[PDB]
Structure formats: C-alpha cells, structure tokens
Design a protein around this nucleic acid. Sequence first.
RNA 1: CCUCUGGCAUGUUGGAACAAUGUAGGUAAGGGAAGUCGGCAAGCCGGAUCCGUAACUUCGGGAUAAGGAUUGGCUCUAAGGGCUGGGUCGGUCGCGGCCGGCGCCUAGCAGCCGACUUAGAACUGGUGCGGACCAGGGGAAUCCGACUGUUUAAUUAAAACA
RNA 2: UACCUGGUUGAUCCUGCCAGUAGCAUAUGCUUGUCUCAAAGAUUAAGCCAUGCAUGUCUAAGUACGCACGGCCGGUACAGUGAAACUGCGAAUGGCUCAUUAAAUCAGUUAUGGUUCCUUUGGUCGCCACUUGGAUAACUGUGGUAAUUCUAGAGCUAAUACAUGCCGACGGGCGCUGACCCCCUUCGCGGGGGGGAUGCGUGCAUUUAUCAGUGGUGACUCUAGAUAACCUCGGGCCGAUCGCACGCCCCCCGUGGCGGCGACGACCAUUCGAACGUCUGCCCUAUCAACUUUCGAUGGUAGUCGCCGUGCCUACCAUGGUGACCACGGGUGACGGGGAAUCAGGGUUCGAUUCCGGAGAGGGAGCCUGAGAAACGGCUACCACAUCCAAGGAAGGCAGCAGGCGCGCA
RNA 3: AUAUUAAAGUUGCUGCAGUUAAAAAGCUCGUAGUUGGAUCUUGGGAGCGGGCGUCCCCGCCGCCUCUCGGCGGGGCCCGAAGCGUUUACUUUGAAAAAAUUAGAGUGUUCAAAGCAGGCCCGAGCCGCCUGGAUACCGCAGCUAGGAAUAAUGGAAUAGGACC
RNA 4: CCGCCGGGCAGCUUCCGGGAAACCAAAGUCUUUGGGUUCCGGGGGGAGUAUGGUUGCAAAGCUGAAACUUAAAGGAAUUGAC
RNA 5: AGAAGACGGUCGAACUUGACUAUCUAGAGGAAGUAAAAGUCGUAACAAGGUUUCCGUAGGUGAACCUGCGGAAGGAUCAUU
Lengths: 152, 206, 262
Amino acid sequence: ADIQTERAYQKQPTIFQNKKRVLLGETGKEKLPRYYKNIGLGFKTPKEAIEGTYIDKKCPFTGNVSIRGRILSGVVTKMKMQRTIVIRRDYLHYIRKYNRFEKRHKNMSVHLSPCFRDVQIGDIVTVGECRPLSKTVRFNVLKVTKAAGTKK
Amino acid sequence: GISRDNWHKRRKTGGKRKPYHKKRKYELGRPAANTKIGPRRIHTVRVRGGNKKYRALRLDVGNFSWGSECCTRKTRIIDVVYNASNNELVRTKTLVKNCIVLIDSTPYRQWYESHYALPLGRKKGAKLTPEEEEILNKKRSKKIQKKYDERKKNAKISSLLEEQFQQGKLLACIASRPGQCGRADGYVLEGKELEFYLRKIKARKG
Amino acid sequence: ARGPKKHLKRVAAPKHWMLDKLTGVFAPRPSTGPHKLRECLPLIIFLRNKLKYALTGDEVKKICMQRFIKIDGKVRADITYPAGFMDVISIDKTGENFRLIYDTKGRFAVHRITPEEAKYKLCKVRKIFVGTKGIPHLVTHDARTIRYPDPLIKMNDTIQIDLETGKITDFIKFDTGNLCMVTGGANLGRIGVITNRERHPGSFDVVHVKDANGNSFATRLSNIFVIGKGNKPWISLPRGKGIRLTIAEERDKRLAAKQSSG
RNA sequence: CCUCUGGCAUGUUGGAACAAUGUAGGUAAGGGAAGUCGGCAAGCCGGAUCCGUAACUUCGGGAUAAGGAUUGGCUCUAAGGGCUGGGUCGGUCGCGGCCGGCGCCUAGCAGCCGACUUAGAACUGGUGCGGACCAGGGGAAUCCGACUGUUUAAUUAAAACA
RNA sequence: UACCUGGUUGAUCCUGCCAGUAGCAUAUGCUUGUCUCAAAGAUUAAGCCAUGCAUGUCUAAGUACGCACGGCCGGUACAGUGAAACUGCGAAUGGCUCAUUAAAUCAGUUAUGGUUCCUUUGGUCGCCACUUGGAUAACUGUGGUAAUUCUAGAGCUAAUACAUGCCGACGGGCGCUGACCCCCUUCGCGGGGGGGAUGCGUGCAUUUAUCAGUGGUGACUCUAGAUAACCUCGGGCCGAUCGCACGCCCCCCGUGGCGGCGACGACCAUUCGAACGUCUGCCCUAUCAACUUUCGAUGGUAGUCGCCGUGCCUACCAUGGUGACCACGGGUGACGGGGAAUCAGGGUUCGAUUCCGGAGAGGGAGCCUGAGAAACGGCUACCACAUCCAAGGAAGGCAGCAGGCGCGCA
RNA sequence: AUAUUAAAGUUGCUGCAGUUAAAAAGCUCGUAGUUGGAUCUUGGGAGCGGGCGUCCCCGCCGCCUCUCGGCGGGGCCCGAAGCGUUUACUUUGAAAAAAUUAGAGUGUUCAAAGCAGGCCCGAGCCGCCUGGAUACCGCAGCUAGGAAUAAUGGAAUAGGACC
RNA sequence: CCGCCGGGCAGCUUCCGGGAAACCAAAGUCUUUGGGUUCCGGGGGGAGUAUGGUUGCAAAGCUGAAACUUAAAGGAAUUGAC
RNA sequence: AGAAGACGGUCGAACUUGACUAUCUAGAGGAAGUAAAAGUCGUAACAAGGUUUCCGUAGGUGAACCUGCGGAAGGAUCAUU
Ligand SMILES: [Mg+2]
Ligand SMILES: [Mg+2]
Ligand SMILES: [Mg+2]
Ligand SMILES: [Mg+2]
Ligand SMILES: [Mg+2]
Ligand SMILES: [Mg+2]
Ligand SMILES: [Mg+2]
Ligand SMILES: [Mg+2]
Ligand SMILES: [Mg+2]
Ligand SMILES: [Mg+2]
Ligand SMILES: [Mg+2]
Ligand SMILES: [Mg+2]
Ligand SMILES: [Mg+2]
Ligand SMILES: [Mg+2]
Ligand SMILES: [Mg+2]
Ligand SMILES: [Mg+2]
Ligand SMILES: [Mg+2]
Ligand SMILES: [Mg+2]
Ligand SMILES: [Mg+2]
Ligand SMILES: [Mg+2]
Ligand SMILES: [Mg+2]
Ligand SMILES: [Mg+2]
Ligand SMILES: [Mg+2]
Ligand SMILES: [Mg+2]
Ligand SMILES: [Mg+2]
Ligand SMILES: [Mg+2]
Ligand SMILES: [Mg+2]
Ligand SMILES: [Mg+2]
Ligand SMILES: [Mg+2]
Ligand SMILES: [Mg+2]
Ligand SMILES: [Mg+2]
Ligand SMILES: [Mg+2]
Ligand SMILES: [Mg+2]
C-alpha cells in the first residue's frame, strides 16, 4: 500500500531491508534506511527526497542516474506524463542577411523526480543532462524556482 | 535480422523516419532464451568483440542467498511461482530476472541447525531423537555451550520463514539474467517483500 | 568505414609534421602506439626529413633495421612507431640522442642532448589507480603503468623516469609557481610558471601561464605538462626557450641576425 | 432444425416391380453464357467479430457499397458485481443492553454470496470449424416514376392512379 | 573601379521592361607556333557489360622425410636452399560512385559516471612433464562427371593446427570447525584467562548476495577491502605454454643451476578507433492544417534481447507526444561539410568531383567468418537480367584500372 | 548556344514601390505575431600625470562574510560561500583538422606555382645558418571583465535583519 | 457682438519640403535614406481565365496557375491637328 | 562426439491481389486564347465620339453591345446670388 502500487515490489536497490533482532519494538523509529546521494555541481539534494519514502530509479538524487553533460534552464509547460514533464526552451535565432532575429522554441521532454511535489506549470526549471532514460528523455529535473509572480 | 534500433520507428512528433542505411550487425537482436526449469542446458553465443553470452535453456540449480542469515547454498530451483511482467511466463515456468521462484529449503535448514543449534521445521520426534542430540551432546562443555547460548534471542527467525521451512521450499527471487549469464542466482524473499509476494500470490489464487 | 582505417592521406596528415603537398597521395600514418597519431612524429619523418639521414622510406627502413634507432632507449624496428613528446630517440651509432620537444611554433624540434640526461625522461601522470590487492598504479601519458608509486604523485603531476629500470625517480607536483610547457592548441611550445589554475566543475579546467618575459597567457589544463619546481627546469629546453615572439619581434630578430652577424 | 406435455396414423386404398416419358430434388471432368429474345432456370453470395469502404449527394445518405481477414475442439489467464461486519478500552445493568471515554478502516480491509459476457494466450486435428439449420451476389451505366402508398378478385403491378 | 548605354514619343519628363555590357562553367564553331601547370563519362542510364589486370603473404625464430635442388659428416633425429601443402596474418583499408537520405545525413559542440575494441605500447602472467593422445594435408596411389578455383575412396606422415594434462608447496601460512588440555577464582552452578590434535575452506576472472567504510571524482550503486557461496559445467579463464640463437658455472663428475630474443595467452591501462547519446543549425512547398496512437504514438513498472543507456522489443498500467515560433505530408535537376563563382558595403548563386563524414555495390532480403562486415573483386535466397549444358546439371555482378556497347549537347 | 553572378535600389536588411504609371483588404473587432512612455547612484571626495588656483586625463570610496579555512586564547587575510536575482549585449581568454583564402619569408630565370633555400667555404668546415610564419574560421557551446541599453525578479490578506 | 482654448468638416495661402508631374502642409520631415506595425506591386497580354479546394439554394464569392504569346503597354505634361 | 531430416518460432526477399499517390499521354465533340490575312457585318470607344463614359449587379442582343437599379468623375459643371 501507499508506495507499492505496481506488480513488482518497489525497493530501492543498494539498501538491504532485513537485518534485525533487538528490543524496543520491531524495527527502528525511522524504520527504513533511505538511500540517497548528492548529485553535485552545487545542487541542494532536497529534503523531500531524503525525508520522503517514494522510490524512483530515475531520481537524480535517490536513484541510479548520473548527471553529466549540459545544464539547461527551461520552463514547465505540461505535467501530464507520469514522473515526467515537458519544458519549453526559447531562444532568438540569428539570421544574418537581415541583421535581425527569429524566435524559436524546443519543447524537450524531461524527467521530473518526485522529490518535487507542488511544482506547477510556468515554473522555471533547470535540468541536468544524463543518460537516455526514455526514447525522448535525456534530462532530469534538478531545481525549480516557480517564483514567476504567482505567490510563494 | 531481428534488429534493435531507433531509426525504424517514428519521432517525437510522430512523423515517419526514412532509412538512410540498411541493417547493421550490431543494430541487432537474437531470439530469446526463455530458459525453462529442468536439467542443465546452456548454449554459448559469440557476441560483439568475441566474448561469450551463455544462454541458459533449462536450469535447476541456483545460487540463492538467505540475506539476513548470510548463508548462500546452491539449491534446486523447484518451481516458478510468480512473475511481475507477465502471467504467461509463470504458466510456462520460465526463469528470468525478478521472477519469484521456489527453491529447496534444505541447505538453509541444515545450516541453521549446524550454526544456531536449534531445529527448523516442526516435527514430533523422528528428527529430534537421533540427529540433533548427536549434533548437540556436549562432551566439551564450557566453551561451545557458551557460544551457542551467546547465539541467544538471536536465532529468532521470522514467522513466515519458519513456516516456509516447515513446508520446505523458499520463495526466492532471481537476480541474475539467465539468458546472458547462464546461471540463475538470487535471494530468499524475506520480511516485507516476502509478505508482499505472498499477498500477491494469495490474490491470484482467489 | 567497415572496420579500422589503415591509410593516411597527405593533407589529412597533421601540420606539425611539415609534410609537403607534391610527393605523394599519402602520409605515413603512425602505428598504434604510446601517442595519439595527431600528436606524434612517426620515426620515418623524424629520420628522412628532420634528420635527413635517409632519402626515402627505404633508406629509413634500412637504418631502422641495423637496429640502431632506440626510442626511449629500447630498440624499435618500426618507421611508424610514433615517437612523441618527451620520448628520446637515442640513435646510438653517431650518438646524438634527442628528446623531441615542442618548439615555440610547435613542431617537435630536433634537440640533441648529452647521454647523461638522455638517461632520464619526464612524464605527466594521467591517473592513479589502486588495482587488486591494494597495489596502487600510475599511468604516464605515454602508457607506462608504473606500479607502487609515492602516495603523493597525484593527477597532472610529473615524473622523471629512469628508462633502464623504469621506476619513478623523483617527481614534481603541479602547483602554482612551477615550470611547464603547453602540449596543445595555440600556446603549444610556450613555457612559463603557472600563476593560476581555475577549477570549473565538469567543464574542464583553465590554467594561466605567466611566461618569463612578461606574457601571461592561458590554456586548458589537459595541455599543461610540468617540467620544473618554478623557473628551474628538469630538462634541457630547445633554444627559443619556450618564449614565443610577436611576428614583428621575430622579423626584427631575423633582420639583426642578418647583415651584422657573419 | 431436434425434443417433453398433449395429439396423430401420412391426408379417399393396398401389394409387386424400378422401362420410356414425366413432376420434385441432387451431382457433374475441361471449358464457362459459346445457349437463348433475354443469364429464363439454377449457381455464386450469405451469420457474427476485426479491419476497410468509391463516384455521386438534397450532406440525411450512398453502405452489408466495394475489398479483405478470422471462426472448431480443448486448457488456462485477465477484466468487468452484490451483501454483511469496527462504536474494540472503562463502568455499570441484564452472550444482550445502557452510559462515558478512546478508535473512527473516512487510501478502506475482512469474510460470505451470485449471474453472465468480453478480451487475450497455450496446445490440438488429414486446413476443419456460421461444419446441419438459417442466410444479400457484386459493380459500371442509361430510360421512367421523386420517394412510402394504391391498381385491373380470375392473363396487364407498370413508366398507370395517389 | 560603390560605372551604365540603345529601344515606347511630333518632341518632353517619368514608370517600366526588353536589348546590350563584363565575369564564370558545359557544349560547340573556326583557328593554333613554343614552353610550364592541369580538369576530363558527373549531368542522360546507380543502364549494360567481350577480354586482361586490380590482394596477397616467410623470417635466425610455427610444421619439410617432394627428393625439386644440393651439401660434407655422418650415422647422435636434426645439418643448408626449398615447390607444395597445413598453420598464422591480411582480404573491413585502399579504389569507385553519389542512387537513396531534409534534424536524417552532416558541422560545430558536448557525454560515455551508459559500451565494445585485432593490434600497438606499459603493467600484471607461482607419475607425461627428460614432454602425453590421434588426426589430417601436400605426397603415393584408385577414381567419378559433358563441364567449374567439382571433388570421393585407399595408402602414409608433421604442428604453435586439434586435443589431453603433471611436478612446484613450505602436515607449513591464514579463515572457520574445534578430540581435548592447562591456569586462576568459587560452597558450587558459574565467571575470567590461555593453549590445542582431527576436519572443511585454503582465489586472480565469473554469477549472486551481504558487511564496513586504501585511492579517487563534482559525481557513484566508483576503486580497493571483509564474509558467504557460485562456477558462464568438457562448450568460465589465466591457473600449470611452443620456437630460435650463441653457449657457461658447481666446497662437484653426471647431475643441478644460466643470460639473450621469438611466439603466446587471462585481466587492467594504452592507442587506433568504433558506436550510440547532449545543445544549435538545412533548399522549396498550405492547390499540405492538423498530425501521431492498442501493429509503440508519448510516459510509467517488471522483464527481453542487445557490447551497453533508451518503446529496442514483450507484458501490465497511464493518456500522453508534435503543431501557425509552420508539425504532418509533398517536392527537390538534394549526398552533408570544408569550399567555389561572383561581388563596394549588404547579398545572390553553386558545391556528382582529388580532404573529412556518410551511403551503395543490378535490385531487395538473410547470414558465416572474424576484433571489425549484415562485406558483395564472401556466401544463401527471390526477382531482374544474362552464360555453357552430353538437358541430369553447372557457373555470374566494372558505381576498381583499361576497354567496349548503349545514352546523349557532353 | 545555354546555366549562372554583377549590372538589379528590376525582390530592396542596408534599399525599391502602392494620388494619377502595376499596386491600401468595403468597413470595424480580433488571438497568435511584431512593437511598447517616463522613472532608481548621483554630482562630489582624495591623490599619481598633463597642459595659491582653474581645464583635461589615470588607480580608489564586487557589498557582505569572520556561520566556514588558516596563505587554553588570538590576529593576518586567503581557499569556500549569500556567486556574479536571471538573461540578452559587448569585450577578453580558451577551444577550434589540413587543403583552400588572405598574408609573412623565399629571383621556381619571370610568372602561375612550390616549400624551401642560403652560406661559408681553395672543401680540411669534413661543415654551418636557417625557414616550413601570422590572420580569419557564421551561428551554437565554454571562460573571465564591463554593466549604458532592453528585458527580468524581489516587502502589500506582510515581510528583512538581531548573543 | 468680439476674442482665447480643445477637438471636427473643409477652405484659401506661399520658394516649408516634396514630387514624372498634375499636384500635395501632406503626397513634407527620403542617397543627410531605419518611430511602430498590417496589407500589398514587380513590363504588357494570356487572366482573375484553367484546375484543385472552399463557401453559396442559385447567381456567384474567396483562394488561384501554367503553356502560349508580345516591345512596349502605361502615367504626367507640351506643341499641334481635330 | 555428432550429419541429413522434421514441429514451432524469428527475420523475411519474393510473388498474387486490391487501395491510395505522383507523373506522362490517346480521345469523337465542345469551348477559349493567341498569331498570320489585301476577307465579311457593322460602328462600341477616344472631340457631347454624335445616347458622358465608367463601376457593381440583373435581363436581353448577330456582333461590337443595349436597358434597368445604386454608385463614379477618371466630366462636358471646383462657381448661379
Ligand atoms: Mg547584412
Ligand atoms: Mg573506403
Ligand atoms: Mg406418403
Ligand atoms: Mg394410409
Ligand atoms: Mg381427408
Ligand atoms: Mg461442369
Ligand atoms: Mg449470344
Ligand atoms: Mg446462336
Ligand atoms: Mg434468376
Ligand atoms: Mg452503389
Ligand atoms: Mg442524356
Ligand atoms: Mg413509382
Ligand atoms: Mg389480374
Ligand atoms: Mg400478375
Ligand atoms: Mg520615333
Ligand atoms: Mg540582359
Ligand atoms: Mg578510446
Ligand atoms: Mg532527383
Ligand atoms: Mg556498404
Ligand atoms: Mg552496373
Ligand atoms: Mg551484401
Ligand atoms: Mg567489381
Ligand atoms: Mg541578377
Ligand atoms: Mg548595387
Ligand atoms: Mg520599381
Ligand atoms: Mg489607369
Ligand atoms: Mg493603376
Ligand atoms: Mg481603402
Ligand atoms: Mg522604456
Ligand atoms: Mg509616399
Ligand atoms: Mg525608403
Ligand atoms: Mg505582369
Ligand atoms: Mg484593298
């Protein structure tokens, strides 16, 4: 229940959940020992990853997946896939005959780990490139500002 | 032939990709192992760069590990019980990774009884009278009993497992990828997981 | 390409080989070796262009197979063995013994040295290892897995190697205030002390180099290979000294050398 | 189509033979309308599921257009529903009640019942499976009458009347 | 070099175009003494192909009993050249062409902490061993077929081919087990301290699991270590191997030790790379506006395969994903790029073509070998073309270089 | 003869037209697009340097941090950190195949080319001196400075700092 | 009745300045060329035709080619002739 | 040790059949456009062109065209107390 909503049991790898025989009830206070890591480059691996119990192999903090390569800001346009979103990266392409520009957007798909609750659309998101982890996806979500006007 | 490659399916948008080359021996697949249970049968394959891939085809022994207890005897793969992917693999009885098989309890049993000096799997008085007394009978005294008394409220195995042994197979999950490795090694379902897969199986029986 | 490529076109050839246009289709193409093709001097070129000893590839072939030539002193019978930066080329019967060191223009200078000195070389470490049973290794740029180094030689530092024995013989830790020669890009051949290293995580790391004669300039760490404990170098340098002159300063220095000196 | 309740004695006779002509049913090598006024007659088609459906059009249709695929037997899987249950701790009164305090499944879980479909798989046969039965042949065009409806009881159903 | 002139009118000034002018390619006409460079079957027909050639290969150092040559020496095999053959390597480069292919190719940029890598270099390589088994080629001889770089039977005989497999090594060392034994204390159970035969393990690589936190990184589920087992069982592996040149020394005589190469292997680094990924960028086209999707579209969980990360594929879930910032489709006289021609500054056009990348070998498919091929101067199919046939059968691929036919302005 | 460039300001960003020569939708709304007023640290202060005072030029007033590291109590200011609120822009640095192109050097006899040559020397030196440069390499990506312009944040049912 | 202010409809006026000009205070602020932005033309014909789409009951509308042709067609103004 | 063979699967040429799509072409008859020409019928237009031409729209007409409605000046009136 709660977590295990799938056909297979959803255990984090790495950590064994089984060595125990002492007094003061069954298991500890925290009960499980959660595996997480820090993801580097100066990024705060958040509370909701480490505190929280959820499980995702495609979490850049609490699962197997190296951030390594390009780092890109976008802005979240949809959230309708499960554990993944689409971000629209917009940019003024230069044409040089007319010493002018043209606007251009590339809505790349992106993996949003559910360390991040309470992310909305129109929210600036900084993705880190990683290994291809869907047919389209190559970017995990690393930090989300959301502060574009609408409230704290 | 039976190929793996991106080029042959549509894009993000859903256009049709044109092929610029033809199939390439590396953009390549091979027909599956789907190794059944039975007497040992492995065919090795040459792969890229030479090297080998040992496709299992039948199998019986598996190097499963009682995690908590840290024993890991090699044991009969007695039957496949559950598989998360697809119910048909269970029905055909096909060993692949993350299956839930059953494995003979016996080598774990034996070891519990030689290590912890208690019994496992309850019985009236056929096992208890001849063998366990002979395993015990402390002609030394002092040291060995002190060690086995130090194996205190500590032996204290789970309720589900103690039950399993007294039946006498273990629920076990496969960690190897038989079709590539050749083996079928795994671990013994314990505690929270075991409880989960028992609840899955009961439901399937209805 | 169905498999590996085996030829090298003249022109596809690197510039620092001074290989001319009309002479063949091809350039040699080094062998797989202790240096990256792009950064070598195939012993052939070294011999029958720079040392002009031979005239063709045949004459190179014949020299090579009286078993004279001795790259980092071990006897090589390949013309395409890539002899590269801070190797030796003991030619023995003549007894010149060189090093190949990047001239300020950056072309592997012909640089003769004394047999004592041609004992030792100098190698940038590419990594520390710890292999099985807790033996630590190094790896020089040019392939030499040393094993059991001083737990001190860290990355980007250098080692003076004995040649005969192998084995690290004294070593210099990359820091600020340490001599170096740059082994890449534009500032190839130039020399100075360091002054500054910028760490940028991931995106690889710059290092400025202050030349002796003022000129501060920069590069990425990759190309910096150290050769001293600040000012004082652990080898011979070729004249030009890893300085690099402005095209006009160079033109002067030629103009002064002409007419007056003779 | 086959059967049970109920009813009958094959429809104003029986017997023997099994020729021609007939009446009613079938089958036919190869060809396939050459027959004939004319494809008259019979023959093909046919059920369901899944695809897939043109010109033209009053935009409603055309349409089951056309055109394809599947169907048996067996052994499994999956999917779809109902009912009832906790007021447990403490007190007191007669397993039941009444009071007070927790609990409060408020992601629900537990036990007990019940039709019937549908989808998927494995095996299986002498490729046979809507096995009988029931059950559209298609298409391109023209002439007429919009249509549905009606009409000469006993030769004309039509383009006639409406 | 930041250029204009002729032509509408009876004349005029304009708008405007036509026409001239100068470059560059392709062709062609007519002409042509000398010398140096130098493009050249791309445009049409990625149409067809007569003939010949274009990939072979041996050192001191893998197998020589051709006897084909010859020694100088016998008889202690072997001496020295050496056709042939087995073995090893190479044939994946080079060469050619530009048909396809429009974020595809390709260019710049970045990842591989998501994989492979023959070789090259550097590491590692503790009772048949005075050395084992049988086989096969050339050779010799029987042959069969009309015919092929067709082969079958019978004789033999090699190995670095193919197989098989031992001494080392210290009843010793370290992990468990532990017959037992000893010392101290105690009313004694007990408590503490020691020693210890006999057993199992007595690990580099592999597979799985667990425990801890030598060296590393912006970054570990890394490297290294500990425990448990497993062996991807003969078709896990190194464990433990064959060749050549000189030729020495034993507190010692018949034995035991020895340097210098060659070749080989498992794992690691190394190079050459390869392979997939990241960000940005392409000609026309709306008489192309929606497109994609239970036959993977876009996500998710578990697998499968694959060298590995990914809907690569299967299963079960979810309903996603792209689009007027031009998707989807269509076209292209479209291989991409470096570059080329023009030019004041801006531009326009071109880039089959000598470097780089890609693609393909009449077309499509499949695959063996091998590190590397979905090779085509490899196979197996079908189709299309073609060639001998004794009619049963057999062989083929110039978009290599020459050459021809065909096509054409070329 | 044909393609193609200049001529062609006859495709026009630079830079063309649209009263009458060809051309402004019959009108208004209208989303995407494109475009968008003014506004916040400024004079000054103090010196080195030039034509007692004036007019021009050059380092200074990146803030804070000491919660972090050190080049039984401390200083000293560097590594880290509230990284420059977040871009564009510019400037610098790196990184950028060669050939081509531009462009040094150099009597290929000149030149197109090429990459070499040139010298001492009676040769007795048994040789020597040298070149094989530099620039450019859109856009994108990376690095540091600048902060005018143009965007963009921050405290408004309240929020920033304090043994 | 006589002023002034904003905003309309125009008018006259001139060497503002433009324009081939007739003219225009805009048609000006243009080789001293860039406030913002939409629609649009690219010799004359063929032709707003054919074709496809779309709308409409129809009539028709919106979108909209090419082959072929052809050295002018055109505007403004002048002198004449009529 | 192990050949031929065979069930099934997998890739999948290839063929047969429809379906769409692009291009290229034949066609009785029809109805355009252009160009040649020393034709035929007129006289629409430019002078008030002898009915201001012109627009949009309808019907008609051998042909240019005419007429109806509402527009235009690019008129043959910048003006009528
Ligand atoms: Mg420009
Ligand atoms: Mg090639
Ligand atoms: Mg009857
Ligand atoms: Mg009767
Ligand atoms: Mg009757
Ligand atoms: Mg018949
Ligand atoms: Mg007939
Ligand atoms: Mg007849
Ligand atoms: Mg009938
Ligand atoms: Mg019909
Ligand atoms: Mg008719
Ligand atoms: Mg009727
Ligand atoms: Mg009747
Ligand atoms: Mg009738
Ligand atoms: Mg005239
Ligand atoms: Mg012209
Ligand atoms: Mg590599
Ligand atoms: Mg084409
Ligand atoms: Mg190919
Ligand atoms: Mg051909
Ligand atoms: Mg092939
Ligand atoms: Mg060929
Ligand atoms: Mg032009
Ligand atoms: Mg111009
Ligand atoms: Mg114009
Ligand atoms: Mg007009
Ligand atoms: Mg006009
Ligand atoms: Mg208007
Ligand atoms: Mg403003
Ligand atoms: Mg104007
Ligand atoms: Mg203008
Ligand atoms: Mg026109
Ligand atoms: Mg006449």
